[PDB]
Amino acid sequence: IVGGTASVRGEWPWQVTLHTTSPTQRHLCGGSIIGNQWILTAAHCFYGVESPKILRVYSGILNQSEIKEDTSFFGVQEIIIHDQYKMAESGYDIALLKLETTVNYTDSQRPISLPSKGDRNVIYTDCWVTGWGYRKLRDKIQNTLQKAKIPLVTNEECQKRYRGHKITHKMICAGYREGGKDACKGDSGGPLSCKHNEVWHLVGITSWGEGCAQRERPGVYTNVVEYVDWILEKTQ
Numbered sequence: 001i002v003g004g005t006a007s008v009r010g011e012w013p014w015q016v017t018l019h020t021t022s023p024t025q026r027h028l029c030g031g032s033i034i035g036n037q038w039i040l041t042a043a044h045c046f047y048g049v050e051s052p053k054i055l056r057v058y059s060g061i062l063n064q065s066e067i068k069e070d071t072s073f074f075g076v077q078e079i080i081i082h083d084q085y086k087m088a089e090s091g092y093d094i095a096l097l098k099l100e101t102t103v104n105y106t107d108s109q110r111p112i113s114l115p116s117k118g119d120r121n122v123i124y125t126d127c128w129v130t131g132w133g134y135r136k137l138r139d140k141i142q143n144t145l146q147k148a149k150i151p152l153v154t155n156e157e158c159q160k161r162y163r164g165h166k167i168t169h170k171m172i173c174a175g176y177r178e179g180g181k182d183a184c185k186g187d188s189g190g191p192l193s194c195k196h197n198e199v200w201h202l203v204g205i206t207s208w209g210e211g212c213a214q215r216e217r218p219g220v221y222t223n224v225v226e227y228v229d230w231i232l233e234k235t236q
C-alpha cells in the first residue's frame with residue numbers, strides 16, 4: 001500500500017495473508033474471508049503454484065513477524081479459478097480457496113459480506129485498500145498490515161487512462177487524480193472494502209495497475225458484484 005498507515009489488531013478481520021511454502025515460505029497475496037470455509041482472492045496469485053498443497057492461509061495476522069513454525073494456518077482443499085481467466089490485465093481475475101476446515105469466527109477472523117442484492121446502483125464513497133504490499137515501487141513486503149482510503153473512479157474515466165486494455169463492467173477502478181495512494185506489489189488478491197450504512201462490503205479484489213500511485217493511473221480491481229452469481233454457484 002503506497003501512502004497508507006499501520007492498521008491495529010482486529011481492524012480488518014476478513015483480511016488474510018496467503019503464503020506459498022515452495023521453494024521457501026513467503027507471502028504471495030492477500031485475500032478475504034467470505035464464508036466459514038471460503039477465501040476470495042485473485043486468480044493471478046496462482047501463477048506457477050504447482051498445487052494447493054504448498055499454500056497456507058493465515059487469518060488474524062496484523063504483523064507478518066507473528067507467523068512462526070507454531071502459528072496455526074488453514075490448509076487449502078481446492079483453488080477455484082474463473083474458467084475465463086487468462087491474465088490479470090485481461091480480467092476474470094478471481095479465485096476461491098476452499099479451506100480444509102471451517103474458520104470459527106472471532107474478533108480477529110470475521111467474514112466480509114458480498115455486495116448485496118439490491119445495491120447494484122449504490123455509490124460507495126468510503127472504500128479502503130489493505131495489504132502487506134510495497135509502500136513504493138522499489139520496496140519489500142511490509143511487516144504491519146497497511147490501510148489506505150481510495151475513491152472509486154468511473155469505468156468511463158478508467159478506460160480513458162488504459163486505452164490499451166479492455167476496462168469492462170467486470171472491473172472497478174480506484175485512485176486519486178494526483179496519485180499518492182494505491183495498492184502495490186504484494187497487495188493483490190486482498191480486498192477493496194467499502195462501508196455502506198456501517199456494513200462493510202467486498203466491492204473489489206486488488207488485481208493490477210501500471211505503476212503504483214502514479215497520477216491519473218487508477219488501480220484496477222475485480223468488480224465482485226459482477227461475480228456474485230459465480231461465487232454462489234461455486235460455494236453452494
Ligand SMILES: CC[C@@H](C(=O)Nc1ccc(C(N)=O)c(F)c1)n1cc(OC)c(-c2cc(Cl)ccc2-n2cc(C(F)(F)F)nn2)cc1=O
Pocket residue numbers: 026027028029044045133137140141182183184185186187188189206207208209210211212213218219220221
Ligand atoms: C503478482 C502481481 C502482484 C505482485 O506484484 N505481487 C508480489 C508479491 C510478493 C512479492 C515479493 N517481493 O515477495 C512481489 F515482489 C510481488 N501485483 C501486481 C500489481 O500490478 C501488476 C499490483 C497492483 C494493483 C493495483 Cl490495484 C494497483 C497497482 C499495482 N501495481 C503495479 C505494479 C507495477 F507496475 F509496478 F508492477 N505493482 N503493483 C499489485 C500486486 O500485488
